[PDB]
Design brief:
heterohexamer; E: 124 residues; alpha+beta; 53% helix; B-cell lymphoma 6 protein (chains E, F)
Chain lengths: 5, 5, 5, 5, 124, 124
Amino acid sequence: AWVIP
Amino acid sequence: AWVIP
Amino acid sequence: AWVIP
Amino acid sequence: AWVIP
Amino acid sequence: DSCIQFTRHASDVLLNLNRLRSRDILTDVVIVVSREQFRAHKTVLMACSGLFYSIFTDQLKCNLSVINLDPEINPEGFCILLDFMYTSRLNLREGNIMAVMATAMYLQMEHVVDTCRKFIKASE
Amino acid sequence: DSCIQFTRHASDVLLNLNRLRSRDILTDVVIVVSREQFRAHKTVLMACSGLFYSIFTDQLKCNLSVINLDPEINPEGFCILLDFMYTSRLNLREGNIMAVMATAMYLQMEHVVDTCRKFIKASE
């Protein structure tokens, strides 16, 4: 996997 | 990715 | 390194 | 540990 | 550019965040899963889960100190995923894979859903 | 035991924490260094620095939203160390090593002090 915007 | 720690 | 107690 | 990224 | 990197930094940070959670230091949210409570840090939850990222970027939900999850969510499934968030290790077993997968789908943790699908397909 | 590990987990968590800092999401402290302000997350500071760990485990200082550092501290030195806390990369150069080392000694980040001493001794 999870990558934040 | 997935590995054996 | 830094490791918390 | 320290390495070249 | 001229940067050097401390290899163990990110894992040391994660281990220290888990020690803070374990000692209840600066935890700022209680996650309730079918009457069981789990204390955590909102920033760590946001950094691991698409669902928690959407909850804590909401202008109203960001202020809540208690978040209730769907009561059909398995607390052992949640606990396995919370332990993964704080340590990088996923205790995935034959007896919990279906619950872990359903919980990871709910929490929007695609990398966990992906490994669950691979382990299920290898068994079939 | 039967755990699997997601290799990139800790670095993905760190990258996401840095994106939260960059977007000013859930930052809960302002560090003031000779009239310059740096927003951050207390949990990340505690997880990297012995000084911040001692400040935010204090029953009174844990409640402060503003922490002033000694005005002789170099803000570029502090910024390099804050960037290291959030990314694992230390922008160590000939022009900043003395300031970075003094700041790391103050922040109680022994691994950074150690690499600074090694780079200085290699130059002498």
